[PDB]
RNA sequence: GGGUUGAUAUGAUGCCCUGACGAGUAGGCAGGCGUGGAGGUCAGUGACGAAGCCUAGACCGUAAGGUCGGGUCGAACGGCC
RNA sequence: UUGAAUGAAGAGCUUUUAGUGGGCCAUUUUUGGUAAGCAGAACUGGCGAUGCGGGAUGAACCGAACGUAGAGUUAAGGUGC
RNA sequence: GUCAAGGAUGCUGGCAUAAUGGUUAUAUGCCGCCCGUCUUGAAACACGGACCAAGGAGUCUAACGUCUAUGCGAGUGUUUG
RNA sequence: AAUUGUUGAAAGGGAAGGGCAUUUGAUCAGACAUGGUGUUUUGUAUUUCACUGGCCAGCAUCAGUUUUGGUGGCAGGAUAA
């Protein structure tokens, strides 16, 4: 009779999409990335800063 | 009395109100305009083909 | 008391009076659609009178209902009145305009005896 | 504002009820509306649609047409269903034994069917003895054989029968109808 | 009756199995979105470390919003808008980018604002404005069962499978996108920006390609 | 004028035809008059048939 | 029924269904069949070709009872035998008792052979026949007798 | 576009579910309102007051209009098919 | 994946008949003209037939086309009064 | 079993009548050119209209076309008598 | 009915009339009954009796659509500069 909105209404966000509980439990949308240490090449940096 | 002579304004709009219709092609077109020497033969080739098919079916 | 009804919304309580009925006495207030070619009412200019159209239609649940919540059924006598014996919460009787003073007495008495609501229980009452 | 690609509020252009006030035809439409809704056999939808049809859309089906339909391979014991009138034909001298389920039968058609040991059926006796339309054969009469259809699409080189009151010499057999007087059509 | 209780128990067991399937599919989809995003980021980092340049893959999907109303449209762009199902102002569709649709977008450029939708705005569009087309009859989605009843032959069982077929332009993108009714968006909630709408986005207006800025506009309209 | 596809009619009503319309309202009255005259004649020419 | 006409629906509306421009007038295209060669030629040709001109011989004082010759095809021919005597003639297809069909007394002048009488012999008394009608009657086993 | 018959339920030109749409001259078609008279019907209203007419009094209908109360009045007049 | 993409609001067909057969404007291409609120063409969109918000005002411009309402958001245009 | 899950319920107060509401007159804010008509264009410095009551304009007929309803159906049409 | 007199009400700075909305004046319709355990009861079973429904609201807990804030966690880039 009435269109309840997921993105509100966590009951409808759990009726559709059973993974919303797992996403909200593991936080999964604020997850940290691995700190890699890649350094760009001197050709890229001097082309970027080149006049 | 001077007035508008001819214009093609609104004619394409009226043409496309009920669409521009393609002439609805058919299997077995009419043999109007096809060569009469071909037609007279083709009548007999069809008659003999149907005769032979009826003989082979019965 | 009647059946429980939704709140009655009328959507246009103002009477749809004809254009220039306020201006000419020959033009009565009964609504006529202006069919003129340059008519501002027909062309719906801002500031002009509203014209009756189907969007003003009453809600079907609350249509034909009086403010009491009853549909009015016109009653000429007791046999007309007892058609509403089992429909007292839905229909209210209303005695017709040409009924005698002495016959309105027995219509009103029988309607009180049956529980039927009368919407004009005061016409031709000797006081 | 909506850019409409079609005509809004366009009716389907099909009859949803007969235009007749025949109470028995309204009863038959009631029965076949139930049988079209609740059975999901295509025969009942076809028969319900055909009950709506007008008199020029229900041409009479001759008993010779019925007999020619029963002369089909394996169709000899089917129930011939004519949503319309079944008319007699004296041109056929041998009518078989069959079950015909029609709206109306003429007296000659009914006599010819029951003389050969057949049986004339109304469309509700058909509905109780074949509710899914099992073993049936719907027959339709010829629509373009009507006299009005001769004059339809009249124009040059169409060969389509001028609307005329009196027919003969002096009545449209002249300029426009032969090479000698003017031109040919 | 007892047979009716048996059918109720069978229906609840089937519903739990379908929800387990949907849950594991959504977990797999989240894993592949995360790994594709990390892989593109690390490919850019790796090319910058090698001294090269990683050219990103060209965008496979646009979201197109009709920003211009109904009157005074020429017949060829009007026909292209009707073929892209943008029949009223602030209607949006997803369009698969190939050459056969880029020349449609070039034809209707003064009347639409289009760009490259992200997963977040696709998810919010299908979650809030998502409606189906079932007996044409515009059914609100609201349930994975009505997506399984119509797109289930293509393997789409849920609103997230439907989102996945859009964001990764799948084999059944055409059927999923045509199942989706055109999104009836509102006017943007903070305005358009842009004092005048009908110049190009480059020229300070709204129309045309708005490459990754369509998400801001569509989230304001949603 | 001559207009759409319709048969050509020869309605001969270009005279003062309304001065010569004979409507037979008296069909029933003249039937009763004929029967009265037959009965009257038979009584006059009794037994003759 | 005057109430079902569209005059009663055109009450209130100015031009009464006839137009504000076209403005229903007396006789704007002529009166009758006027201008069938000039301004209605596109209607006379196209839907009435042949209206103008002469075709052949005039017949002075035609009597249509000279030309009275109603045609009865052979696919009927047994409707002229009454319905209850018909079946006992159909069975026992016999010479020396063959049904005599006076066709002039039924009101026909010519017999045509449109098709397929049964193989029962009949005497057919007829003013005229066609060749195929004669062949089909003699093939079924009867004979045509000419009367006048 | 559908649902609804082994008390649907006795409103199946019904009731209900679903979705979309609604500008308009000339024009077309549909559904209705009103008038004079006719067949039927309500064993309808009426000298204890019919019709009419007046009424910045009331009610119903989107509207055509319908209904009622009061005044005036004096012999007839309505509802429905 | 039966031989590109996109859409399809159902597709195809028939009969019958109303009105109309004075047009006008605008961007672009144009002919006659010194030019025009001139006369004449091409394609489109409009006005006629059409209200609404803006251009103070205006048939045609801009925005946007209209059932009856509520709330939100905007378009074109604006924000000293 | 409960729930925020296929659309509002719980608790409380005042009044119980002109208080809410209706009609009506007026005032205020903003809007609102006189209708009909011919016209590409009408508020026009185009035409008709001083006001009111009653009357007042697609009718009937002969012969037909399409469509539809009905009766009978290779037949059909009793009503000239 | 046009048109007019009197009386009563009202408004009135180069028209009047009209639309939406409310103030003010005038005027008017609609609803408290109800089912109810309860007998302090008279005509001994009539009846003894705080419940209920009409109008306007206040708060709380929700649902839908929105608008406006506060704040937290991540990601990217020259792994900002
Ligand atoms: Mg809804
Ligand atoms: Mg009203
Ligand atoms: Mg009104
Ligand atoms: Mg009037
Ligand atoms: Mg105009
Ligand atoms: Mg704001
Ligand atoms: Mg009218
Ligand atoms: Mg009109
Ligand atoms: Mg006129
Ligand atoms: Mg002779
Ligand atoms: Mg309309
Ligand atoms: Mg009458
Ligand atoms: Mg009486
Ligand atoms: Mg009276
Ligand atoms: Mg008055
Ligand atoms: Mg008297
Ligand atoms: Mg009356
Ligand atoms: Mg002309
Ligand atoms: Mg001209
Ligand atoms: Mg003209
Ligand atoms: Mg030049
Ligand atoms: Mg206009
Ligand atoms: Mg404007
Ligand atoms: Mg502006
Ligand atoms: Mg200006
Ligand atoms: Mg300004
Ligand atoms: Mg522009
Ligand atoms: Mg608003
Ligand atoms: Mg009161
Ligand atoms: Mg108030
Ligand atoms: Mg003003
Ligand atoms: Mg005009
Ligand atoms: Mg004017
Ligand atoms: Mg004058
Ligand atoms: Mg005058
Ligand atoms: Mg009058
Ligand atoms: Mg007066
Ligand atoms: Mg003065
Ligand atoms: Mg809330």
Collapsing DSSP states into helix, strand and coil, what is residue G73?
Answer: strand
Q: Is the CB atom of residue C27 positioned under 7 angstroms from any atom of strand J?
A: yes
Q: Which pair of structure tokens corresponds to residue D185?
A: 């059509």
Cα distance between residue G148 and residue G134, in whole Å = 17
Q: Which pair of structure tokens corresponds to residue F43?
A: 């009584």
- The phi, psi pair for D167, rounded to 5°, reads -120, 125
Q: Tell me how crowded residue E102 is: count the other CB atoms within 10 A of its CB.
A: 13
Cα distance between residue C41 and residue G90, in whole Å = 83
Point out which residues pair with E96 in neighbouring strands. E61
Q: Is the CB atom of residue E51 positioned under 7 angstroms from any atom of strand I?
A: no
Three-state secondary structure of chain E: CHHHHHHHHHHHHHHHHHHHHHHHHHHHHHHHHHHHHHHHHHHHHHHHHHCCCCCCCCCCEEEEEECCCCCCCCHHHHHHHHHCCCCCCCEEEEEECCHHHHHHHHHCHHHEEEECCCHHHHHHHHHHCCECCCCCCCCECCCCHHHHHHHHHHCCCCHHHHHHHHHCCCCCHHHHHHHCCCEECCCCECECCCCCCCCECCCCCCEEECCCCHHHHHHHHC
CA E187 to ligand 6 centroid distance, Å: 12
Q: Is the CB atom of residue C43 positioned under 7 angstroms from any atom of strand H?
A: no
Interface of E with A in 56-95 (CB under 8 A): none
Ligand found nearest the CA of A9 = 39
Collapsing DSSP states into helix, strand and coil, what is residue D84?
Answer: strand
Strand J, nucleotides covered by protein (CB < 7 Å): 3-7, 22-24, 31-33, 35-40, 42-43, 51-53, 58-60, 62-75, 79-81
CB-based contact D165 F8, cutoff 8 Å = yes
Q: How many helices (H) and strands (E) does chain F have?
A: 1, 0
Tell me the resolution in Å. Answer: 3.0
Are the C-beta atoms of residues D61 and D82 closer than 8 Å to each other? yes
CB-based contact A19 E30, cutoff 8 Å = yes
- The phi, psi pair for D179, rounded to 5°, reads -55, -35
Collapsing DSSP states into helix, strand and coil, what is residue D79?
Answer: strand
Chain F positions touching G29 (Cβ under 8 A) are 1-3
Cα distance between residue D33 and residue D51, in whole Å = 10
Largest CA distance in chain A: 64
Residues in contact with G114: Cβ distance below 8 Å, sequence separation at least 6, in sequence order: G73, G74, G75
Largest CA distance in chain C: 60
Q: Is the CB atom of residue C64 positioned under 7 angstroms from any atom of strand J?
A: no
Vertex D118, ends D116 and D122: CA angle to 5°?
Answer: 145
Largest CA distance in chain G: 84
How many angstroms away from the CA of E143 is the closest CA of chain A? 6
Ligand found nearest the CA of E73 = 27
Q: Which pair of structure tokens corresponds to residue C77?
A: 């006598």
**Which residue's CA shows the smallest distance to C1' of I63?**
E69
CB-based contact D172 G75, cutoff 8 Å = no
Vertex G41, ends G36 and G46: CA angle to 5°?
Answer: 115
- The phi, psi pair for C101, rounded to 5°, reads -65, -35
Cα distance between residue B20 and residue B14, in whole Å = 10
Cα distance between residue E37 and residue B25, in whole Å = 53
Question: Quick one: how far is CA G89 from the chain centroid?
Answer: 31
In terms of Cα–Cα distance, which of G93, G106, G138 is closest to D93? G93
The spacing between the Cα labelled CA in B2 and the C1' in I34, in angstroms, equals 24
* Chain A residue closest in CA terms to E160: A17
Q: Residue holding tokens 């007396």?
A: G26
Q: Tell me how crowded residue D138 is: count the other CB atoms within 10 A of its CB.
A: 18
**Is residue D80 packed enough to be buried (19+ CB in 10 Å), middle (13-18) or exposed (0-12)?**
buried
Q: Does D6 touch chain E if contact means CB atoms closer than 8 Å?
A: no
Torsion of CA G94, G95, G98, G104, to 10 degrees: 140
Collapsing DSSP states into helix, strand and coil, what is residue D61?
Answer: strand
Are the C-beta atoms of residues D138 and D83 closer than 8 Å to each other? yes
Residues in contact with D56: Cβ distance below 8 Å, sequence separation at least 6, in sequence order: D143, D146, D148
Vertex C69, ends C64 and C74: CA angle to 5°?
Answer: 55
Q: Does D94 touch chain E if contact means CB atoms closer than 8 Å?
A: no
Cα distance between residue D82 and residue D138, in whole Å = 6
CA C99 to ligand 7 centroid distance, Å: 36
CB-based contact C35 G12, cutoff 8 Å = yes
Q: Is the CB atom of residue D152 positioned under 7 angstroms from any atom of strand I?
A: yes
Q: Is the CB atom of residue D10 positioned under 7 angstroms from any atom of strand I?
A: yes
Cα distance between residue G99 and residue G94, in whole Å = 9
Q: Residue holding tokens 């909105």?
A: A5
Q: Which of D1, D4, D5 sits opposite E69 (nearest CB)?
A: D1
Helix (H) or strand (E) holding F30: helix F27-44
Cα distance between residue E72 and residue E69, in whole Å = 8
Chain G positions touching C35 (Cβ under 8 A) are 12-14
Q: Which pair of structure tokens corresponds to residue E98?
A: 């190939």
Q: Which of E38, E48, E128 sits opposite A5 (nearest CB)?
A: E128
CA E131 to ligand 6 centroid distance, Å: 28
Q: Is the CB atom of residue C117 positioned under 7 angstroms from any atom of strand K?
A: yes
The spacing between the Cα labelled CA in C92 and the C1' in K71, in angstroms, equals 62
Q: Is the CB atom of residue G9 positioned under 7 angstroms from any atom of strand H?
A: yes
Point out which residues pair with E191 in neighbouring strands. E189
Interface of D with G in 120-179 (CB under 8 A): 154-156, 162-163, 169-178
Ordered DSSP codes for C44-107: T-TTS-----GGGPPPTTSTTB-TTS-EEEEESSHHHHGGGSS-TTTEEEEE-TT--HHHHHHH
Q: Cα(first)–Cα(last) distance of chain E, in Å?
A: 47
Collapsing DSSP states into helix, strand and coil, what is residue G110?
Answer: strand
- The phi, psi pair for C28, rounded to 5°, reads -80, 165
Q: Tell me how crowded residue D36 is: count the other CB atoms within 10 A of its CB.
A: 19
Are the C-beta atoms of residues A6 and E127 closer than 8 Å to each other? yes
**Residue ranges with CB less than 5 Å from ion ligand 7:** G 12
Point out which residues pair with E112 in neighbouring strands. E66
Ordered DSSP codes for C7-55: PP--S--S--PPTTTTT-SSS-SS------TT-HHHHT-TTS-----GG
CA atoms within 13 Å, Cβ hemisphere of A14: 8
Three-state secondary structure of D35-53: HHHHHCCHHHHHHHHHHCC
Cα distance between residue C21 and residue A39, in whole Å = 88
Chain D positions touching F6 (Cβ under 8 A) are 163
What angle, 0 to 180 degrees and rounded to 10, lies between the N-to-C axes of helices E2-50 and E159-167? 30
How many angstroms away from the CA of D17 is the closest CA of chain G? 22
What angle, 0 to 180 degrees and rounded to 10, lies between the N-to-C axes of helices E119-128 and E214-221? 20
Q: Which pair of structure tokens corresponds to residue D26?
A: 């309204």
CB-based contact G27 F1, cutoff 8 Å = yes
Q: Which pair of structure tokens corresponds to residue G69?
A: 């010759």
Are the C-beta atoms of residues D61 and D140 closer than 8 Å to each other? yes
Chain F positions touching D164 (Cβ under 8 A) are 7-8
In order of A14, E37, E117, G40, the CA distances from E30 in angstroms are: 16, 11, 17, 78
G128-129 and D61-62 strand pairing: unpaired
Ordered DSSP codes for A1-51: ---PPBTB-HHHHHHS-TTHHHHHHH--SSPPPP-------HHHHHHHS--
Are the C-beta atoms of residues D112 and D64 closer than 8 Å to each other? no
Residues in contact with D2: Cβ distance below 8 Å, sequence separation at least 6, in sequence order: E70, E87, E88
In terms of Cα–Cα distance, which of A23, A24, A31, A30 is closest to E27? A23
Interface of E with D in 51-80 (CB under 8 A): 69-71, 73, 78
Q: Which pair of structure tokens corresponds to residue G112?
A: 């045509």
Q: Is the CB atom of residue G13 positioned under 7 angstroms from any atom of strand H?
A: yes
Chain A positions touching E53 (Cβ under 8 A) are 44
Chains C and G touch (3+ CB pairs under 8 A): yes
CA E112 to ligand 6 centroid distance, Å: 24
Chain G positions touching F5 (Cβ under 8 A) are 47
Cα distance between residue D139 and residue D69, in whole Å = 8
The spacing between the Cα labelled CA in B11 and the C1' in I5, in angstroms, equals 30
Point out which residues pair with F6 in neighbouring strands. none
Cα distance between residue E45 and residue E39, in whole Å = 10
Point out which residues pair with E64 in neighbouring strands. E93, E114
Cα distance between residue A6 and residue A13, in whole Å = 5
CA C40 to ligand 31 centroid distance, Å: 15
C91-95 and C71-75 strand pairing: parallel
Are the C-beta atoms of residues G85 and G108 closer than 8 Å to each other? no
Are the C-beta atoms of residues C48 and C41 closer than 8 Å to each other? yes
Experimental technique behind these coordinates: cryo-EM
Q: Which nucleotide, over all strands, has the C1' atom closest to the CA of E222?
A: I73
Are the C-beta atoms of residues G52 and D67 closer than 8 Å to each other? no
Are the C-beta atoms of residues G17 and G6 closer than 8 Å to each other? yes
CA E199 to ligand 26 centroid distance, Å: 23
Q: Which pair of structure tokens corresponds to residue C99?
A: 């009924």
Q: Does D4 touch chain E if contact means CB atoms closer than 8 Å?
A: yes
């Amino acid at each position: 009779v009435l269109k309840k909105n997921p993105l509100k209404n966590k009951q409808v966000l759990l009726r559709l999409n059973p993974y919303a509980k797992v996403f909200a439990a593991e936080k999964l949308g604020s997850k940290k990335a691995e700190k890699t240490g890649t350094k760009p090449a001197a050709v890229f940096t001097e082309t970027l800063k080149h006049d | 009395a001077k007035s508008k002579n001819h214009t093609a304004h609104n004619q394409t709009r009226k043409a496309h109100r009920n669409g521009i219709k393609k002439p609805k092609t058919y299997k077995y077109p009419s043999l109007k305009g096809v060569d009469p020497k071909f037609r007279r033969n083709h009548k007999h080739a069809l008659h003999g083909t149907a005769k032979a098919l009826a003989a082979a079916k019965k | 008391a009647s059946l429980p009804h939704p709140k009655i919304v009328k959507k246009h309580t103002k009477k749809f009076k004809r254009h220039h009925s306020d201006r000419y006495h020959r033009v009565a207030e009964n609504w006529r659609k202006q069919k003129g070619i340059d008519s501002v009412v027909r062309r719906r200019f801002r500031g002009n009178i509203s014209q009756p159209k189907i969007g003003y239609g009453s809600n079907k649940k609350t249509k034909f209902l009086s403010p009491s919540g009853h549909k009015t059924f016109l009653v000429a006598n007791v046999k007309d009145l007892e058609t509403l014996t089992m429909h007292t919460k839905t229909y209210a009787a209303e005695i017709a305009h040409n009924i005698s003073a002495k016959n309105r007495v027995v219509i009103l008495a029988r309607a009180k005896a049956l529980g039927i609501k009368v919407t004009n229980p005061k016409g031709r009452l000797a006081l | 504002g909506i850019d409409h690609t079609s005509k809004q509020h366009k009716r389907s252009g099909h009859r949803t009820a007969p235009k007749s006030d025949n109470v028995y035809l309204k009863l038959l439409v009631k029965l076949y509306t139930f049988l079209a809704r609740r059975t999901d056999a295509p025969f009942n939808k076809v028969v319900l649609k055909a009950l709506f049809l007008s008199k020029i859309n229900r041409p009479p089906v001759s008993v010779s047409r019925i007999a020619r339909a029963l002369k089909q391979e394996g169709a000899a014991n089917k129930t011939v269903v004519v949503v319309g009138t079944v008319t007699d034909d004296a041109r056929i001298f041998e009518f078989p034994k069959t079950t015909v389920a029609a709206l109306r039968f003429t007296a000659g058609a009914r006599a010819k069917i029951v003389k050969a040991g057949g049986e004339c059926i109304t469309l509700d006796q058909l509905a109780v003895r074949a509710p899914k339309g099992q073993n049936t054969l719907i027959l339709r009469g010829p629509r373009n054989s009507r006299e009005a259809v001769r004059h339809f699409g009249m124009g040059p080189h169409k060969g389509k029968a001028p609307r005329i009151l009196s027919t003969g010499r002096k009545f449209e057999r002249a300029r426009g109808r032969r090479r000698s007087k003017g031109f040919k059509v | 009756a007892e047979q009716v209780a048996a059918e109720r128990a069978a229906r609840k067991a089937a519903n739990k199995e379908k929800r387990a399937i949907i849950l594991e599919r959504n977990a797999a989809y989240q894993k592949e979105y995360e790994t594709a995003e990390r892989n593109i980021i690390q490919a850019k980092r790796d090319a910058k470390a090698a001294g090269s340049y990683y050219v990103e893959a060209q965008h496979k999907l646009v979201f197109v919003v009709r920003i211009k109303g109904i009157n005074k449209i020429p017949p060829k762009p009007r026909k292209v808008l009707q073929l892209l199902r943008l029949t009223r102002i602030n209607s949006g569709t997803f369009v698969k980018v190939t050459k056969a649709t880029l020349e449609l977008l070039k034809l209707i450029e003064p009347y639409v604002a289009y760009g490259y939708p992200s997963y977040s705005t696709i998810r919010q569009l299908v979650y809030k404005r998502g409606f189906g087309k079932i007996n044409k009859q515009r059914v609100p989605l609201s349930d994975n069962a009505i997506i399984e009843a119509n797109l289930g032959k293509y393997g789409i069982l849920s609103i997230d499978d439907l989102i996945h077929e859009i964001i990764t332009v799948g084999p059944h993108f055409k059927q999923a996108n045509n199942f989706l009714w055109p999104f009836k968006l509102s006017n943007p909630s903070g305005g358009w920006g842009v004092p005048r709408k009908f110049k190009h986005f480059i020229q300070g207006g709204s129309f045309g390609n708005r490459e990754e800025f369509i998400n801001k506009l569509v989230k304001s309209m949603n | 004028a001559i207009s759409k596809n319709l048969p050509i009619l020869k309605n001969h009503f270009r005279k003062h035809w309304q001065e010569r319309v004979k409507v037979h309202f008296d069909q029933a009255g003249k039937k009763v008059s004929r029967r009265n005259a037959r009965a009257t004649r038979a009584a006059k020419i009794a037994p003759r048939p | 029924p005057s109430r079902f006409t569209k005059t009663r629906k055109h009450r209130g509306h100015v031009s009464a269904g006839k137009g504000r421009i076209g403005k229903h007038r007396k006789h704007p295209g002529g009166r009758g069949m006027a201008g069938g060669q000039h301004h209605h030629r596109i209607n006379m040709d196209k839907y009435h070709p042949g209206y103008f001109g002469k075709v052949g011989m005039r017949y002075f004082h035609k009597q249509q009872a000279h030309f009275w010759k109603p045609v009865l095809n052979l696919d009927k021919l047994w409707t002229l035998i009454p319905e209850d005597k018909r079946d006992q003639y159909l069975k026992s297809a016999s010479k020396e008792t063959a049904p005599v069909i006076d066709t002039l007394a039924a009101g026909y002048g010519k017999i045509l052979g449109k098709g397929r009488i049964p193989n029962v012999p009949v005497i057919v008394k007829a003013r005229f026949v066609s060749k195929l009608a004669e062949e089909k009657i003699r093939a079924a086993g009867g004979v045509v007798e000419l009367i006048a």
